[PDB]
Design a binder for this molecule. Structure first.
Ligand SMILES: [Mg+2]
Ligand SMILES: [Mg+2]
Ligand SMILES: [Zn+2]
Length: 600
DNA sequence: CGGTACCCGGGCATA
DNA sequence: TCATAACCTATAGATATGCCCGGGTACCG
RNA sequence: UCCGAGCCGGUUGUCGCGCGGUUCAAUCCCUGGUGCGGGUGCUAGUACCGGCUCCGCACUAUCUAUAGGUUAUGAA
DNA sequence: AAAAAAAAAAAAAAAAAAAAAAA
DNA sequence: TTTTTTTTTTTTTTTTTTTTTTT
């Protein structure tokens, strides 16, 4: 819910021009960054070591113990019985990890706050990674082992004879996923390939709630599947499949944002005793370090700054906390017709890859937001070219290209990764210490914010200050197709919500396959024009590209005798938007979706 | 040389 | 197949108070 | 491995058109926007403003880390 | 006899709903 | 009653076979 919000600002503006305080901030975050970096690797190192006998039950204490051992080492003297047990178990491995990596204990004082944030954040990473991807990888494992891609090509489609494999797969999947209890009558008929897959999944020992499906169990207790997820990665490595990061690692050497709260502020920045700070208000204590009078720290929507920020030496994120905090199908236009009628103007958007947004209204005013426009305004490609050139000058590209894979689940393989990373850590650390790397992150945010701000401003001047957006439901969220490039599809819904612009979803079925002029898909033609490939590397290779954004209608009524082409050309994005307006117009009038676009 | 008593501050627990 | 940036998308969490005890100091016998 | 947008045509609501022409906009420094006031600045006239630009008042804009897919570079 | 350009057809990847035969 | 698979939808790309033309 709307209980927290953030306002990013630059390091110079956020903090007062005090050299001493600023230097302490940079030094403190650097130490915390190192602890987080090695802690994540140390956690994986411990898991890969103890997995030979018994898989550890990773818990918040496990991550906390690793962080404390890296900082204090044997000097850490926890009083809780549970934490003490982890200290003894983990101490031998942390010392061994330090020797391999050469890390020296910072012995930082008053790190309790930093450890808690890192422990909670890192523990959250374990839950989310397993929660949202255990099913994905397991299903992918089944397909790769059976080579479903090979079977599809080898076995002709739409043939009753070959339907047995897909029907066979369902029975196999149910047994593997424990949806159906295995029985002798079926196991005897398993082919050797199927039998091998059965044993491998059984070795994973998937937790399974008898009263709920497997998917529900993952959501209910995702961490219970962590032992299986790590062991699943081993199968990928064994068979050469594309490995996945079972255990998250903070590999990046660039300055990562470190949360700084009131407790950390006085202990490290002001360097004053706890009693001295307790006698001063939290807001007053911050004013001696940060310029709270600036725009970022001002309250919004009843949310006030509560002495919690994250900084990385170039940008500062200011968090506003609501007092009511925890203290540590409906979006479719069909269900929102009354709102659309009262809307001053309705704009239909057809998302695409090159044309991220293609907007049209009843007046026919066309507006688009292209990927090239975003790249130039955002400067991502400009930064990418500069970043690549800078690496070549420093020679770091040759170093990073040969780093052993960190996704390996083998102790020996992971040890090589640490040794290689340690071998050139100094040179790469110096290269990444340059302000440019952090500035690009901050400059990218400014450029991205301005680019979106101009988009809204341009749209408002194009269609009006207040308008309703009916955006197509198409989106490749998290599943970008091969080739092409990443594009913003579902993020525009949030952006419109932020700008108080109503956003509604509309089905795109047959929106790009019906001619609006005649409302018929019988005479619509596609993929009829061909030209040399637009991609320069493909063009030199001699490959040819087929025009996709150009459509045409051969219906005689849409034709004119003067044309030698014989078809009324239509732009794909323009054609889709026009059809959407027809769909919206019919729905508003109460006639529902046109039968031509019906899925029926 | 021996034992009591007071205070500050660091460090650790906990929801 | 691997590594290093980025763009997007999804998840979870987004601080503070109380207590123990070690070191230093003072005091009398 | 390269890329901006708007407009006039070849076009007929036509194409990553390495088709022609035409107007601006950013390549560095920068948290963004809306409104309500107040004030050095340059482009015309002998009572009046589209502009870009910084001061105070309000409102508004959620990020960090990890992970999946993709892109660029360096390696197989 | 040989080679190059353009048209035609197909496949690949993720997912939405809708219709169907089988647990 | 309930369920997983196949078909038609967006977007964009990639891939192979064939004929016509030129040499
Ligand atoms: Mg569409
Ligand atoms: Mg489209
Ligand atoms: Zn038509």
């Amino acid at each position: 819910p709307t209980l927290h919000t953030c306002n990013k600002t630059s390091f110079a503006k956020a903090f007062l021009p005090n050299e001493t305080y600023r230097q302490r901030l940079l030094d403190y975050i650097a130490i915390i960054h190192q602890l987080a970096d090695h802690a994540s690797h140390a956690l994986k190192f411990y898991i890969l070591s103890t997995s030979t006998s018994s898989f550890p039950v990773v818990h918040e204490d496990t991550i906390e113990a690793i962080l404390y051992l890296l900082n204090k080492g044997e000097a850490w003297h926890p009083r809780k019985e549970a934490k003490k047990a982890w200290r003894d178990c983990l101490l031998p491995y942390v010392q061994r990890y330090c020797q391999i990596v050469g890390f020296i204990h910072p012995n930082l004082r008053g790190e309790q706050q930093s450890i808690n944030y890192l422990t909670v954040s890192m523990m959250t990473n374990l839950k989310v990674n397993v929660q949202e991807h255990f099913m994905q990888m397991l299903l992918r494992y089944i397909n790769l082992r059976f080579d479903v891609k090979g079977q599809k090509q080898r076995l002709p489609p739409k043939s009753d004879a070959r339907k047995a494999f897909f029907t066979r797969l369902r029975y196999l999947k149910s047994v593997f996923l424990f949806d159906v209890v295995p029985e002798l009558e079926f196991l005897d008929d398993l082919t050797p390939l199927e039998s091998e897959v059965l044993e491998e999944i059984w070795s994973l020992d998937l937790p399974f709630l008898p009263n709920d499906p497997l998917a529900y169990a993952i959501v209910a207790d995702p961490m219970s599947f962590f032992p299986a997820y790590c062991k699943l990665s081993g199968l990928y490595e064994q068979y050469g499949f594309q490995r996945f990061s079972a255990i998250p690692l903070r590999r990046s050497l660039i300055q990562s944002h470190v949360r700084i709260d009131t407790i950390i502020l006085y202990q490290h920045i002001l360097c004053i005793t706890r009693r001295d700070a307790e006698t001063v208000e939290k807001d007053d204590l911050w004013m001696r370090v940060c310029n709270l009078c600036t725009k970022a720290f001002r309250s919004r929507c009843g949310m006030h700054f509560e002495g919690s920020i994250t900084t990385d030496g170039a940008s500062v994120s200011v968090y506003l906390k609501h007092p009511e905090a925890d203290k540590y199908k409906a979006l479719y236009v069909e269900n929102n017709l009354p709102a659309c009628r009262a809307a001053e103007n309705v704009v239909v958007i057809d998302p695409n890859k090159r044309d991220i947004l293609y907007c049209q209204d009843s007046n026919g005013t066309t507006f688009r937001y292209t990927a090239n426009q975003r790249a130039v305004e955002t400067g991502s490609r400009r930064f990418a070219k500069r970043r690549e050139a800078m690496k070549e000058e420093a020679g770091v590209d040759l170093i990073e290209s040969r780093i052993p894979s960190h996704k390996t689940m083998n102790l020996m393989d992971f040890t090589r990764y640490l040794l290689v990373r340690r071998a050139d850590w100094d040179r790469r650390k110096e290269f990444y210490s340059h302000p440019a790397h952090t500035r690009w992150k901050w400059h990218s945010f400014i450029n991205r914010q301005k680019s979106e701000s101009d988009l809204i401003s341009n749209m408002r001047n194009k269609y009006g200050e207040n308008f309703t957006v009916v955006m197509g439901d198409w989106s490749d969220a998290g599943r970008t197709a091969r080739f092409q490039t990443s594009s913003k599809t579902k993020g525009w819904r949030t952006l419109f919500k932020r700008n108080r612009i109503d956003c509604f979803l509309l089905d795109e079925y047959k929106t790009s396959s019906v001619c609006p002029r005649c409302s018929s898909s019988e005479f619509v033609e596609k993929k009829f024009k061909t030209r040399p490939h637009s991609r320069p590397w493909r063009r030199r290779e001699g490959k040819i590209e087929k025009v996709h954004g150009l459509l045409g209608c051969t219906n005689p009524n849409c034709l004119q005798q003067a044309w030698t082409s014989g078809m009324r050309y239509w732009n794909r994005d323009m054609l889709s938007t026009c059809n959407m307006l027809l769909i919206v117009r019919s729905m508003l009038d109460g006639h529902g979706r046109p039968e031509v676009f019906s899925r029926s």
